[PDB]
Amino acid sequence: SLAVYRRKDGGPATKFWESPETVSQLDSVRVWLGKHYKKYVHADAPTNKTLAGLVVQLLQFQEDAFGKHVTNPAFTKLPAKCFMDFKAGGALCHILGAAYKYKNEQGWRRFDLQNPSRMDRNVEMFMNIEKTLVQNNCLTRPNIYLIPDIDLKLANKLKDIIKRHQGTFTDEKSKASHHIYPYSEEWLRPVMRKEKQVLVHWGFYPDSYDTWVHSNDVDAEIEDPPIPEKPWKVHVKWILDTDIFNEWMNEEDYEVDENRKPVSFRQRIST
């Protein structure tokens, strides 16, 4: 099976971030930072490759501090998709901007993420990054409605998980981002192409486990992702698996219709 390639942890795909093409994609991020976070990046005047290296350090830090292997993590992982938004003014801009702003406000001389002596204030930096993403409408954490058929004990467990992962829950279905239904294999979905490589998403793994594999190992085309339609209809394992990975899972893997039947908007490819 192709799962021999599957990432064993949700740390950064270092080869992607060191690619010359990825470094060149950060040019517009660098330029945008020099205007909209000018007070906080002028000192360091970071290059495209320095920014790529900082992304790797930030991604490695949150996997080390908040990944699946951690018991009692102090924070929930930021969505991997946030780091892949290279548009001027997008999520990566605000992640890097917030990081440099926080460093400046704390008087740090350098970022020190690989250093175990420096985790409690690095955790606070990630809480600040998440606040900045929410405030700039790059990130919305789930506001969840539980369908009435979910029984009391299971609902109680789900509410605990939701709250511990920066989510909220509501009794007003029309205001919810997600509707959760009762739950009634080994597959992947290709999601991005770059030269002769394809990024694949593994079913029931979070996006930080997405893995770059050879294009000729996936005989399927990348289908367009679903257009966001409020609300997502997913079954309870979307929340239960979020607690395993300390990372909100991908709704597409858990989607159902209003009669709880599984929905696969994009085709699932057996591994």
Numbering used by the authors: 27 to 210, 216 to 302
Task: Provide text from the study.
SWI/SNF (BAF) chromatin remodelling complexes are key regulators of gene expression programs, and attractive drug targets for cancer therapies. The BAF155/SMARCC1 subunit is a component of all complexes identified to date, incorporated either as a homodimer or as a heterodimer with its paralog BAF170/SMARCC2. Here we show that the N-terminus of the BAF155/SMARCC1 subunit contains a putative DNA-binding MarR-like domain, a chromodomain and a BRCT domain that are interconnected to each other to form a distinct module. In this structure the chromodomain makes interdomain interactions and has lost its canonical function to bind to methylated lysines.
Residues 27–383 of BAF155 were expressed and purified, and their structure determined using X-ray crystallography. Residues 4–160 form a four-helix-bundle that resembles the MarR-like helix-turn-helix domain10 based on structure homology analysis using VAST:11 43 aligned residues, RMSD for CA atoms of 1.9, score 5.1, P-value = 0.0005 for the highest scoring protein. Residues 169–287 consist of a BRCT domain with a chromodomain (residues 219–246) inserted between the second and third strands of the canonical fold. Helix 2 that forms part of a phosphate-binding site in many BRCT domains is missing. The individual domains are linked via a network of hydrogen bonds to form a single structural unit in which a highly conserved stretch of amino acids in the α3-α4 loop and α4 of the BRCT domain plays a central role. Analysis of the sequence of human chromodomains shows that the BAF155 domain clusters with so-called “chromobarrel domains”. This sub family of chromodomains have an additional N-terminal strand that precedes the chromodomain fold: the BAF155 chromodomain does have a chromobarrel fold, but in this case the residues located at the C-terminus of the module form the additional strand. Residues 28–33 pack onto the chromodomain, and a main-chain to main-chain hydrogen bond is formed between Leu28 and Ile300 linking the N- and C-termini of the module. The N-terminal residues interact with a region of the chromodomain that in others forms an aromatic cage that binds to methylated lysines. The architecture of the fold produces a cleft containing two deep pockets at the interface between the domains. Analysis of the sequence conservation using ConSurf17 reveals two highly conserved regions on the surface of the module: the first on the MarR-like domain and the second within this cleft.
